[PDB]
Design a protein around this ligand. Structure first.
Ligand SMILES: Nc1ccc(Br)cc1C(=O)N1CCC[C@@H]1Cc1ccccc1Cl
Ligand code: NI
Length: 560
């Protein structure tokens, strides 16, 4: 059998005590009252996950598959990519990346200490000399926060040692950063800020005489990825103009790490063996994106979809095409699904044809409509606020390595719920500790950034434009979704938030400087007598390079 996993019976074990119930402090009730709805996943559900993700993969590859692949390799052949030096790779490591098993940590790597650097050189040398020995990985259960829907089992994270991760950056950081946009062009989702994503989708939608669209949800995508898929990815990478040392490092990491390897729990026991995508390597995002695009492109051909345009972000897939009527479309999607299945990517929820752009969810998000200061209709990116709000409830009472609320304000700044609930609540908390100036870690497209909350108005103006501070008259469908979420979690109604916001705003203005700019721009929506919002001079000085270039989820990337 071609099983995604084989297991020894050893348990996936935790690294510390794990909390599953929402921690509660004196601030918790100001955000939500239904605490029993928020939970975190733990290793206790890791066995249930192992069950779901362990299956036999069969793959039948036809001429559409090979045709798309040759086209992809033709574009990949135009890419020239460079090896990073050790210092460069080290400086890309998150400060609290998991320490090495060889007696150094992420801080020693970042500081280029002799023990970290020497070992990295020794790992590199071993990669060039040995192209067969499977590389050990650690398997963990992720602790992630959700609202009961009741419970999702914990996801599994599979990752190699810190020295190897630095070596992966050296060989592949420039490749995974530049190749997907070259191969997939306008279809590569991670090149877009949220506004550009919205622009791409709307323009694509308008470019069809009779538009039809659908999202495609692969069942446990990482588990569907076969040895073939992973060797196909390597062959694409090798199309690049690369140093012969990078060629050798990439071959080696493919053979020894990417295709598969033994799994070790946190106690050092052998848990079994992986034959599918490792969720915590540098190539996780790029590999998944390339493989999802290959399979989907070939499936579009197989299904004879007319004038199909895709948007792919890792395992996340949206297709927009020419409609041929409701019946022909439902038929086409069934053929598309069959093709995908034959390629090892069967669906979770079966895909359905959609005739309203606003109702297509991709990357957990949708397009919606609001109005700017001049009353002009404006499209913007939004999402169901449930998960953002559950994580904020958790982050309200617990410090966490990644502040999802901050990532969410940045990505969803134009939304009704980010502005009325998240900015209000978190600025209120930060004021009360005078922690406005304290840099916080967050993630955007899987890479980690250290961000000062006082820089939000400028960050938002750079990413979303001044209109993100001006939007009004949101759509009934959006207002109803937000209101439904507030009922579910026991969040105070929007009117309470408006009230609180006038207070937060007044408090920030009182502080002058950057704090007062936050009060001015972020909360201008809260007062009847609205201030005049002008371009912020600090905004045009922001080094927002690399922000929306590529996706690095699982990839251990720090861009600060
Ligand atoms: N007109 C707006 C202006 C700013 C923001 Br943020 C949201 C809106 C907006 O469309 N709505 C509709 C539902 C909530 C909000 C209006 C509202 C209702 C009660 C209290 C405060 C507000 Cl801003
Ligand atoms: Ni076989």
């Amino acid at each position: 059998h071609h099983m995604s996993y084989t297991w020894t019976g050893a348990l996936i074990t935790p690294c510390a005590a794990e909390e599953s119930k929402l921690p509660i402090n004196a601030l918790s009730n100001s955000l939500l009252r239904h605490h029993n709805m928020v939970y975190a996943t733990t290793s206790r559900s890791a066995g249930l996950r192992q069950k779901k993700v362990t299956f036999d993969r069969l793959q039948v590859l036809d001429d559409h598959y090979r045709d798309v692949l040759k086209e992809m390799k033709a574009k990949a052949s135009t890419v020239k990519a460079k090896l990073l030096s050790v210092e460069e790779a080290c400086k890309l490591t998150p400060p609290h990346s998991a320490k090495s098993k060889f007696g150094y940590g992420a801080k020693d790597v970042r500081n280029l200490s002799s023990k970290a650097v020497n070992h990295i050189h020794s790992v590199w040398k071993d990669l060039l000399e040995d192209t067969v020995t499977p590389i050990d990985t650690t398997i963990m259960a992720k602790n992630e926060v959700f609202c009961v829907q009741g419970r999702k089992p914990a996801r599994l994270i599979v990752f190699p040692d810190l020295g190897v991760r630095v070596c992966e950056k050296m060989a592949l950081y420039d490749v995974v950063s530049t190749l997907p946009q070259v191969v997939m062009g306008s279809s590569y989702g991670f090149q877009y800020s949220p506004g550009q994503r919205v622009e791409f989708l709307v323009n694509t939608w308008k470019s069809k005489k009779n538009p039809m669209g659908f999202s495609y949800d692969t069942r446990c995508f990482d588990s569907t990825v076969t040895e073939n898929d992973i060797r196909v990815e390597e062959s694409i990478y090798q199309c690049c103009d690369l140093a012969p040392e990078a060629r050798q490092a990439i071959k080696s990491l493919t053979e020894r790490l990417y295709i598969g390897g033994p799994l070790t729990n946190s106690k050092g026991q052998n848990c079994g063996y992986r034959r599918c995508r490792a969720s915590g390597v540098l190539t996780t995002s790029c590999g998944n994106t390339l493989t999802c695009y290959l399979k989907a492109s070939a499936a579009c051909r197989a299904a004879k979809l007319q004038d199909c345009t895709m948007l792919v972000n890792g395992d996340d897939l949206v297709v927009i095409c020419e409609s041929a009527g409701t019946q022909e479309d439902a038929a086409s999607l069934r053929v598309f699904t069959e093709a995908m299945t034959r390629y090892s990517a069967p669906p979770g929820d079966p895909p359905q044809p959609e005739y309203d752009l606003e109702l297509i969810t991709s990357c957990s998000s949708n397009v919606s409509v609001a109005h700017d200061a001049s009353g002009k209709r404006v499209y913007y990116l939004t999402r169901d606020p449930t998960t953002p709000l559950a994580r904020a409830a958790w982050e309200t009472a617990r410090h966490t390595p990644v502040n999802s609320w901050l990532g969410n304000i940045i990505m969803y700044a134009p939304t009704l719920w980010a502005r009325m609930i998240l900015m209000t609540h978190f600025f209120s908390i930060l004021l009360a500790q005078e922690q406005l100036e304290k840099a916080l870690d967050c993630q955007i497209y899987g890479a980690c950034y250290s961000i000062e909350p006082l820089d939000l108005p400028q960050i938002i103006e750079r990413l979303h434009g001044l209109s993100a501070f001006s939007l009004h008259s949101y759509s009934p469908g959006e207002i109803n979704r937000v209101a439904s979420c507030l009922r579910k979690l026991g969040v105070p109604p929007l009117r309470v938030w408006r009230h609180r916001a006038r207070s937060v705003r007044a408090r920030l203005l009182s502080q002058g400087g950057r704090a007062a700019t936050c009060g001015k721009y972020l909360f201008n929506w809260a007062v009847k007598t609205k201030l005049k919002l002008t371009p912020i001079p600090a905004a045009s000085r922001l080094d927002l390079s690399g922000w929306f270039v590529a996706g690095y989820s699982g990839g251990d990337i720090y861009h600060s």
